Structure 1
Amino acid sequence: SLLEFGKMILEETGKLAIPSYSSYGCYCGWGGKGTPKDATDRCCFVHDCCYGNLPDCNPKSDRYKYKRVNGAIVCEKGTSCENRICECDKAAAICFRQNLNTYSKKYMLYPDFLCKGELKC
């Protein structure tokens, strides 16, 4: 679920999902057009694609379980949708951590009109 993803993001990064990742660049918190602005935004692009892989799942609301094994995220077995959603979220959280070095506050509340053009998953 979105709330679980937000907790995972905070755990990974030390940033609150709202506001740090809820309105960032062209793809975080809202897709779905434009060239991603930076690596963090590309995490969101890929995460959006990852959810897009799951048209019959409901990633905003469906809850999954996960644990930590020495810092590592391990998605625990739920329904097929839950497992796949968890894997999408895990990847994005790791991606955000891997790109914290280049996170730029200037991309918070990035305006829509600067995000133009289709980029295929």
Structure 2
Amino acid sequence: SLLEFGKMILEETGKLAIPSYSSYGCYCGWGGSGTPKDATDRCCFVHDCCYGNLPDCNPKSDRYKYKRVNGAIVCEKGTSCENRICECDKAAAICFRQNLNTYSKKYMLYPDFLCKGELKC
């Protein structure tokens, strides 16, 4: 759920999910169109696509458990949905940490009219 995802983000990047990753670019948060603006936005695109592969799961509200084996994120056994949601979130958190160096505040609160086109998952 968003509760675990937000915590994973904070632990990984030192940034709070809201508002650093909730209105960034075209895909981070409310958002599903246009060309991703930068690496971080591409992380969100992939994350959206990952959730899209789970039509009969509820990733926003279904809670999963994860532990940290030293630095590594390890998803603990749960239902099939919880397992797959956790893997989507883990990937996004790592993607965010890998691209922190290019995170740009100019993409915060990005207006919707600047998100143009389509990218197919």
TM-score (normalizing by structure 2): 0.99
1:64–1:82 CA contact under 8 A, matched in 2: yes
Q: Any idea what the Cα deviations from partners look like across 1:10-69, whole Å, max 9, x if unmatched?
A: 000000000000000000012211110000000000000000000000000000000001
Map 1:80-119 → 2, pairs under 5 A: 80-119=80-119
Map 1:1-121 → 2, pairs under 5 A: 1-121=1-121
- Which region of structure 1 is more displaced relative to structure 2, 78-87 or 30-39? 30-39
TM-score (normalizing by structure 1): 0.99
- Long gaps (5+) in structure 2: none
1:31–1:45 CA contact under 8 A, matched in 2: no
Q: Any idea what the Cα deviations from partners look like across 1:56-87, whole Å, max 9, x if unmatched?
A: 00000000000001100000000000000000
**How much does 1:4 deviate?**
1.1
1:26–1:36 CA contact under 8 A, matched in 2: yes
Q: Distance in 2 between matches of 1:71 and 1:16?
A: 19
